[PDB]
Amino acid sequence: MDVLRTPDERFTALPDFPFAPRYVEVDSGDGGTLRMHYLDEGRSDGEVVLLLHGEPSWSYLYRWMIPVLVEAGLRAVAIDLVGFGRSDKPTSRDDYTYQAHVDWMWAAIEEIGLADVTLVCQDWGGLIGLRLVGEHPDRFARVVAANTMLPTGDHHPGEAFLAWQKFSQEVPLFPAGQIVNGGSLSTLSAETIAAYDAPFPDASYQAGARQFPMLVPISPDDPATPANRKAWAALGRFEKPFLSAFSDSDPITGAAEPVLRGHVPGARGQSHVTIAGAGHFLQEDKGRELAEAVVTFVRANP
Template sequence: MQSLRTPDERFANLPGFNFTPHYLQVSDTEGGELRLHYLDEGAADAPVVLMLHGEPSWSYLYRKMIPLVVAAGYRVIAPDLIGFGRSDKPTRRTDYTYQRHVDWIRAVVEQLDLQDITLVCQDWGGLIGLRLVAEHPERFARVVAANTMLPTGDHPPGEAFLKWQRFSQSVPVFEVGALIQGAITSKLSAAERAAYDAPFPDESYKEGARQFPLLVPCSPDNPAAADNRKAWESLVKFDKPFLTAFSDKDPITAGGDKVLQKLIPGCAGQPHTSIENGGHFLQEDQGEALARVVIDFIQRSR
């Protein structure tokens, strides 16, 4: 598998992002390896909070949350998905599959031997993270799901997602910073927009970002549909604490929180919340508020 690696200088002096990079190697499933980047903040023996980003962001999305969660006494692991951030970027669209993304993040969990995990997941972070919760429930202590879902393709996606999917495949230049700005309620500075663009020097680095919208199971015969149905067989038995913290201004995932609350036993009796004035990327709009929700939830459910 051929891949690109974003030059380190692209990540110099990003606003609000003074974190040390860490790397590990994961199998590309074709006999080679890819370098995956992750943040590892806080004491090594502190309880683990695993923060998974989605499309087309990277761990920069969690910069407002990480210091608060670490200050509360936790260890934060925030990987960059393969194809994003400082992680390697395979060059062919077909290199990116749902299963490979799950396997790549599973490798992070296993290589770092993460246990008693609090998962914080949004967008594709949930599509990947909830699969891992279902397949390895013994490693997870609790879940915070924010603007995400685990679709099986058995129910049609909303028009907002289909519009995004069509746009992602037709727009000639995939401007990541502009896309983030269009999906939030707050105003990014020019430097912050540039930080979201930093992983992608040109269009050749964006094959993963382009492919992600096509990997979401939107029909029952999608290649990932059967695996997600199997995951739901486990999730409907998951009785550890499970909290939904969706935002109030996200047309993509609106209503998904109610589905999760209905189907997952661990949602019963939890203080589910709607975070005000947050768009799809609520970590950007209301990162501090979401961090407080996460901290309170861990402390309440320990």
């Protein structure tokens, strides 16, 4: 596969993001190697909180949450998906599949060497992350799901998702920063918008961003349907702590909240929260509040 790397000059002086870039290498899947970017902050022996972003964001999305987690004595790790952030970026839309993202993310987790992980996931961070919980439950001590789901293709995704999907394909120029603004209640600053555009100097870097919405299973003939059904079944046996921390103003994922909460046995008896006054990208609107909920949940489940 052919692969681009975003020049480092794109990431100079991003506001509120004083976290050193770290990298791991993973197999591309067709005989080469891809570099993936991650952040690793806080005490080296701290309980790991793994922060996974989705479409079309990157670890920059977690910048308000990281300091709260670190101050609480936790180790915050955030990984950029292939195609995003400071990770390498295959050039063909056909290089990106649900399976490939799952394999790439698992390889990153393994290479970094994370154990007894508290997953915090949103959007595609959870479509990938929750599948990984199903496939490797022993790796995850706890799970926080926020504005996400694990679709098998068996249920209609809702009109809000379909409107996003159509826009993502039809828009002539794909404006990642304005998309994140679109899914936030707060007005993102010009510098924040620029931080989300930083990975994508032009359209040649955006194949992963264009393809993601087409990978969401919305019918049972999806290539991910068999694996997602198996992962869903495994999540239905996950007895370890599971927290629902969805926001109140996200039409795309709102319907998924009670389905996920009801399915996972480890959600029973946990103090689920609704993050008030936040849109889809709830980490932008109420990042501190979500991080505080994660700290409370970790401490309540020693």
